[PDB]
Write a protein that holds these residues in place. Structure first.
Motif, PDB file in Angstrom:
ATOM      1  N   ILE A  49     -20.752   8.883  23.632  1.00 48.89           N
ATOM      2  CA  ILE A  49     -22.303   9.007  23.081  1.00 48.89           C
ATOM      3  C   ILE A  49     -23.003   7.976  23.921  1.00 48.89           C
ATOM      4  O   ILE A  49     -22.775   6.614  24.021  1.00 48.89           O
ATOM      5  CB  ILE A  49     -22.244   8.418  21.614  1.00 48.89           C
ATOM      6  N   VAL A  50     -24.286   8.375  24.616  1.00 50.76           N
ATOM      7  CA  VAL A  50     -25.392   7.666  25.108  1.00 50.76           C
ATOM      8  C   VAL A  50     -26.517   6.887  24.037  1.00 50.76           C
ATOM      9  O   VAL A  50     -26.685   7.899  23.480  1.00 50.76           O
ATOM     10  CB  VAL A  50     -25.990   8.324  26.160  1.00 50.76           C
ATOM     11  N   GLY A  51     -26.476   5.682  24.292  1.00 50.65           N
ATOM     12  CA  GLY A  51     -27.624   5.180  23.478  1.00 50.65           C
ATOM     13  C   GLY A  51     -27.316   5.022  21.820  1.00 50.65           C
ATOM     14  O   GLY A  51     -27.938   4.840  20.865  1.00 50.65           O
ATOM     15  N   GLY A  52     -25.834   5.314  21.591  1.00 46.52           N
ATOM     16  CA  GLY A  52     -25.431   5.072  20.319  1.00 46.52           C
ATOM     17  C   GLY A  52     -25.099   3.527  19.624  1.00 46.52           C
ATOM     18  O   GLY A  52     -25.258   2.766  20.558  1.00 46.52           O
ATOM     19  N   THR A  53     -24.554   3.601  18.554  1.00 50.38           N
ATOM     20  CA  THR A  53     -23.984   2.328  17.882  1.00 50.38           C
ATOM     21  C   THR A  53     -22.650   2.693  17.209  1.00 50.38           C
ATOM     22  O   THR A  53     -22.192   3.682  17.153  1.00 50.38           O
ATOM     23  CB  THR A  53     -24.811   1.648  16.889  1.00 50.38           C
ATOM     24  N   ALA A  54     -21.964   1.704  17.047  1.00 45.69           N
ATOM     25  CA  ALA A  54     -20.526   1.631  16.513  1.00 45.69           C
ATOM     26  C   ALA A  54     -20.553   2.018  15.171  1.00 45.69           C
ATOM     27  O   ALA A  54     -21.460   1.619  14.543  1.00 45.69           O
ATOM     28  CB  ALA A  54     -19.806   0.138  16.558  1.00 45.69           C
ATOM     29  N   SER A  55     -19.832   2.976  14.884  1.00 51.17           N
ATOM     30  CA  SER A  55     -19.610   3.389  13.381  1.00 51.17           C
ATOM     31  C   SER A  55     -18.739   2.347  12.634  1.00 51.17           C
ATOM     32  O   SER A  55     -18.047   1.351  13.236  1.00 51.17           O
ATOM     33  CB  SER A  55     -18.806   4.595  13.176  1.00 51.17           C
ATOM     34  N   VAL A  56     -18.722   2.292  11.253  1.00 50.70           N
ATOM     35  CA  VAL A  56     -17.877   1.510  10.485  1.00 50.70           C
ATOM     36  C   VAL A  56     -16.696   2.248   9.756  1.00 50.70           C
ATOM     37  O   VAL A  56     -16.839   3.959   9.953  1.00 50.70           O
ATOM     38  CB  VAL A  56     -18.337   0.638   9.246  1.00 50.70           C
ATOM     39  N   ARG A  57     -15.520   1.811   9.479  1.00 53.48           N
ATOM     40  CA  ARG A  57     -14.451   2.633   8.798  1.00 53.48           C
ATOM     41  C   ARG A  57     -14.920   3.410   7.716  1.00 53.48           C
ATOM     42  O   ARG A  57     -15.696   2.887   6.787  1.00 53.48           O
ATOM     43  CB  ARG A  57     -13.569   1.428   8.401  1.00 53.48           C
ATOM     44  N   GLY A  58     -14.394   4.823   7.485  1.00 55.92           N
ATOM     45  CA  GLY A  58     -14.728   5.698   6.479  1.00 55.92           C
ATOM     46  C   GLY A  58     -16.079   6.326   6.708  1.00 55.92           C
ATOM     47  O   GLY A  58     -16.580   7.333   5.698  1.00 55.92           O
ATOM     48  N   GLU A  59     -17.011   5.861   7.604  1.00 58.29           N
ATOM     49  CA  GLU A  59     -18.396   6.567   7.738  1.00 58.29           C
ATOM     50  C   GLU A  59     -18.448   8.024   8.023  1.00 58.29           C
ATOM     51  O   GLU A  59     -19.399   8.656   7.542  1.00 58.29           O
ATOM     52  CB  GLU A  59     -18.925   5.816   8.916  1.00 58.29           C
ATOM     53  N   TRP A  60     -17.657   8.388   8.828  1.00 51.94           N
ATOM     54  CA  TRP A  60     -17.781   9.996   9.588  1.00 51.94           C
ATOM     55  C   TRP A  60     -16.342  10.607   9.050  1.00 51.94           C
ATOM     56  O   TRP A  60     -15.440  10.906  10.315  1.00 51.94           O
ATOM     57  CB  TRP A  60     -17.944   9.831  10.742  1.00 51.94           C
ATOM     58  N   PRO A  61     -15.840  10.605   7.884  1.00 47.40           N
ATOM     59  CA  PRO A  61     -14.337  11.150   7.579  1.00 47.40           C
ATOM     60  C   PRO A  61     -13.906  12.191   7.844  1.00 47.40           C
ATOM     61  O   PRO A  61     -12.829  12.592   8.010  1.00 47.40           O
ATOM     62  CB  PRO A  61     -14.196  10.726   6.049  1.00 47.40           C
ATOM     63  N   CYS A 105     -29.696  23.221  20.214  1.00 45.73           N
ATOM     64  CA  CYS A 105     -30.019  22.135  21.297  1.00 45.73           C
ATOM     65  C   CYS A 105     -30.590  20.843  20.495  1.00 45.73           C
ATOM     66  O   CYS A 105     -31.215  21.145  19.587  1.00 45.73           O
ATOM     67  CB  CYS A 105     -30.874  22.461  22.276  1.00 45.73           C
ATOM     68  N   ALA A 106     -30.232  19.881  21.073  1.00 43.87           N
ATOM     69  CA  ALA A 106     -30.791  18.538  20.260  1.00 43.87           C
ATOM     70  C   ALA A 106     -30.811  17.475  21.387  1.00 43.87           C
ATOM     71  O   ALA A 106     -29.952  17.378  22.134  1.00 43.87           O
ATOM     72  CB  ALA A 106     -29.792  18.067  19.204  1.00 43.87           C
ATOM     73  N   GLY A 107     -32.013  16.650  21.169  1.00 39.42           N
ATOM     74  CA  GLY A 107     -32.340  15.825  22.320  1.00 39.42           C
ATOM     75  C   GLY A 107     -33.711  14.997  22.009  1.00 39.42           C
ATOM     76  O   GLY A 107     -34.697  15.758  21.636  1.00 39.42           O
ATOM     77  N   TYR A 108     -34.091  13.937  22.752  1.00 42.99           N
ATOM     78  CA  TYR A 108     -35.371  13.333  22.718  1.00 42.99           C
ATOM     79  C   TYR A 108     -36.170  13.881  24.022  1.00 42.99           C
ATOM     80  O   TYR A 108     -35.400  13.752  25.157  1.00 42.99           O
ATOM     81  CB  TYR A 108     -35.056  11.805  22.797  1.00 42.99           C
ATOM     82  N   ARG A 109     -37.365  14.263  24.122  1.00 41.35           N
ATOM     83  CA  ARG A 109     -38.055  14.545  25.333  1.00 41.35           C
ATOM     84  C   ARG A 109     -37.711  13.416  26.462  1.00 41.35           C
ATOM     85  O   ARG A 109     -37.649  13.871  27.577  1.00 41.35           O
ATOM     86  CB  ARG A 109     -39.581  14.700  24.922  1.00 41.35           C
ATOM     87  N   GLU A 110     -37.851  12.141  26.099  1.00 43.71           N
ATOM     88  CA  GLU A 110     -37.593  10.966  26.922  1.00 43.71           C
ATOM     89  C   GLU A 110     -36.198  10.602  27.316  1.00 43.71           C
ATOM     90  O   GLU A 110     -35.798   9.754  27.771  1.00 43.71           O
ATOM     91  CB  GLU A 110     -38.620   9.743  26.504  1.00 43.71           C
ATOM     92  N   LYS A 143     -30.459   9.187  24.310  1.00 44.85           N
ATOM     93  CA  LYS A 143     -29.274   9.376  23.176  1.00 44.85           C
ATOM     94  C   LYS A 143     -29.018  10.492  23.585  1.00 44.85           C
ATOM     95  O   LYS A 143     -29.730  11.933  23.702  1.00 44.85           O
ATOM     96  CB  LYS A 143     -30.053   9.153  21.707  1.00 44.85           C
ATOM     97  N   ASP A 144     -27.620  10.912  23.459  1.00 46.41           N
ATOM     98  CA  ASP A 144     -27.018  12.210  23.799  1.00 46.41           C
ATOM     99  C   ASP A 144     -25.447  11.960  23.604  1.00 46.41           C
ATOM    100  O   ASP A 144     -24.939  10.737  23.591  1.00 46.41           O
ATOM    101  CB  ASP A 144     -27.160  12.763  25.199  1.00 46.41           C
ATOM    102  N   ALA A 145     -24.807  13.276  23.509  1.00 44.97           N
ATOM    103  CA  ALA A 145     -23.403  13.129  23.718  1.00 44.97           C
ATOM    104  C   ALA A 145     -23.152  13.026  25.351  1.00 44.97           C
ATOM    105  O   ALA A 145     -23.937  13.412  25.923  1.00 44.97           O
ATOM    106  CB  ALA A 145     -22.679  14.452  23.123  1.00 44.97           C
ATOM    107  N   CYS A 146     -21.945  12.744  25.582  1.00 40.85           N
ATOM    108  CA  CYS A 146     -21.342  12.714  27.017  1.00 40.85           C
ATOM    109  C   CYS A 146     -20.011  12.944  27.145  1.00 40.85           C
ATOM    110  O   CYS A 146     -19.314  13.276  26.151  1.00 40.85           O
ATOM    111  CB  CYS A 146     -21.856  11.385  27.734  1.00 40.85           C
TER     112      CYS A 146
END
Ligand SMILES: Nc1n[nH]c2cc(-c3[nH]c(CNC(=O)/C=C/c4cc(Cl)ccc4-n4cnnn4)nc3Cl)ccc12
Length: 237
Positions: free
Chosen positions: A1-13, A173-178, A181-184
């Motif tokens: 993930i580009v431009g992401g942040t760390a998840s915490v435990r249990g957030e995306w189960p 599709c999903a993304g910012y014009r500029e 942030k994205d998958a990689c």
């Protein structure tokens, strides 16, 4: 993930890490729990996978570093790749993993709902991509599961950014014009999860893009709603 942040435990189960063990053990792809014996992921994940015998599904993982020789995992009974799949960029990038046993759901391992019957025209405004993939084109698998919020774009806009590809109704599709942030690399197969009326739905499967997080180049996801009949056929067989 580009431009992401760390998840915490249990957030995306519903998020899993699919490992290969040949010729050495490593993260291959993300996936999503959709039933007690069922993972939804991307077909392209199995390029060069000789059989299900070498796969391991780990659930309830935040950090790749948690996985040791005694960490529990689920074996894979079957890989069901869509019969029209050829390559990610041409679509049908969808696969089911039938597990060898049933997930007992816990706070750390939970299913995500498919997009619901009657919701075909819902506008999703709260969508997130998650995974352990690269933070840029030349990187490495990340230890801590990352998350990023990314806006959906219309298929019409997406087709205008990818005039060398057929962007079909079976893609989203999903993304910012500029960009930014994205998958990689290493995120494929994981979810594009959207919250509607405080219920998460598996709207997309991370599939492909041109570079990572570039301006005017949205990420391309398998549009899960267009495969619900296929999923129900395969999971009821
Ligand atoms: N253990 C490992 N070490 N290094 C690895 C690399 C990979 C890996 N996976 C893939 C498959 N594609 C993806 O994961 C996502 C692509 C992708 C998806 C979107 Cl929505 C937008 C842009 C994307 N772009 C990524 N790069 N160019 N575009 N390619 C590579 Cl290479 C898998 C495992 C490991």
């Amino acid at each position: 993930i580009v431009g992401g942040t760390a998840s915490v435990r249990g957030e995306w189960p519903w998020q899993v890490t699919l490992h290969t063990t040949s010729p050495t053990q490593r993260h291959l792809c993300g996936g999503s729990i959709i039933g007690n014996q069922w993972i939804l992921t991307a077909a392209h994940c199995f390029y060069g996978v000789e059989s299900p015998k070498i796969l391991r599904v780990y659930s309830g993982i935040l950090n790749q570093s948690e996985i040791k020789e005694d960490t529990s995992f689920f074996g894979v009974q079957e890989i069901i790749i869509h019969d029209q799949y050829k390559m990610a960029e041409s679509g049908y990038d969808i696969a089911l993993l039938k597990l060898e046993t049933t997930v007992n759901y816990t706070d750390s391992q939970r299913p995500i709902s498919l997009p619901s019957k009657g919701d075909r025209n819902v506008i999703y405004t709260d969508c997130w991509v998650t995974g352990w993939g690269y933070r840029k084109l030349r990187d490495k698998i990340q230890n801590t599961l990352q998350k990023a919020k990314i806006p959906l774009v219309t298929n019409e806009e997406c087709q205008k950014r990818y005039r060398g590809h057929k962007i079909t109704h079976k893609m989203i599709c999903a993304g910012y014009r500029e960009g930014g942030k994205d998958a990689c690399k290493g995120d494929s197969g994981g979810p594009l999860s959207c919250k509607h009326n405080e219920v998460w739905h598996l709207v997309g499967i991370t599939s492909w893009g041109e570079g990572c997080a570039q301006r005017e180049r949205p990420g391309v996801y398998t549009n899960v709603v267009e495969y619900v009949d296929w999923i129900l056929e395969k999971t009821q067989a």
